Amino acid sequence: TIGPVTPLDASDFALDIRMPGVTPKESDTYFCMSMRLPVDEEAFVIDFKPRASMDTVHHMLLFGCNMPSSTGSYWFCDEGTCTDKANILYAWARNAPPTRLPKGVGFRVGGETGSKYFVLQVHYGDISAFRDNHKDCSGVSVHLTRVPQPLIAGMYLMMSVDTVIPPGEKVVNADISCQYKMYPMHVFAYRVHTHHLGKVVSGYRVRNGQWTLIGRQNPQLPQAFYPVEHPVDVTFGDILAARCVFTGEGRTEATHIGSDEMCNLYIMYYMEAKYALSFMTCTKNVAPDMFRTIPAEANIPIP
Ligand SMILES: [Cu+2]
Ligand SMILES: [Cu+2]
């Protein structure tokens, strides 16, 4: 009975972003839908409330973009999520619960530079044989405000494009590094992504030769946003560095990363509103020689 937009008070509204009664028919199904922002001006996403069917739904992702892959009521996410860049805003995983946005922090959508659409991805895990009749309305409610937030959340995406896994090599490192040269960002969560061959992915800020861990995770565990215990400030002159560790054991051919494989690290940050950028990316390895003296911790496996 909840309408897609619910005014909350003079300045805020909730959007209820829900599957239009879908029926997953196999285990391991990804469905996607879109929701345009109802406002054309800038607005700020400041909270999220998951509404997941607690048996079947394994994970949910919410993205902001300007071109969803489809205009239909829903689609299969094999088709893509957005044809333009899809900016992740939120993850939920059943056995790795999200952490709240820090107080005073919002994502900026709408307006001139912000996303016009949300794209929701719902991943349905294992299914009982006998639910061919069943409609599901899983998704997320989103709290938006037109009140300017002091701190603006964004994403710093580190991606590997250059590396290949020679078959049967037990350990392959993919290294990513860029200098940072914007106003300060404060990293408060991260998410890792590879396919079946990823063993561990770690992110670091390097400042005057000293490495500070942002986070490290097995990319085979739930790919939600893990909190960074104490936010890591990243400033002009710092290098960001990431290492994905892959195995090629039991393979029978080269695997290109960046793609039978991928090494993605999503670093969620906030910046002071007047200096904020919503999205930054590193796709290179600017200081490869720096990795000879990476902390040994970066190479230690996680289950
Ligand atoms: Cu999942
Ligand atoms: Cu991938």
UniProtKB/Swiss-Prot annotation:
Chain coiled-coil ranges: none
Annotated consequence of substituting H59A: Impaired Cu(2+)-binding; forms a closed conformer in the presence of citrate with a reduced Cu(2+)-Cu(2+) site separation of 4 Angstroms. Abolished peptidylglycine alpha-hydroxylating monooxygenase activity
Variant or mutagenesis effect after changing Q223 to E/A: Induces a fully open peptidylglycine monooxygenase structure with Cu(2+) distances of 14 Angstroms
Segments of this protein annotated with the region Peptidylglycine alpha-hydroxylating monooxygenase: 1-303
Function noted in UniProt: Bifunctional enzyme that catalyzes amidation of the C-terminus of proteins. Alpha-amidation is present at the C-terminus of many endocrine hormones and neuropeptides and is required for their activity. C-terminal amidation also takes place in response to protein fragmentation triggered by oxidative stress, promoting degradation of amidated protein fragments by the proteasome. Alpha-amidation involves two sequential reactions, both of which are catalyzed by separate catalytic domains of the enzyme.
Subunit architecture: Monomer. Interacts with RASSF9.
Protein name: Peptidylglycine alpha-amidating monooxygenase
Organism in which the protein naturally occurs: Rattus norvegicus
Record lineage: Eukaryota, Metazoa, Chordata, Craniata, Vertebrata
Gene (name only): Pam
Section of the entire sequence shown: 50 to 355 of 976
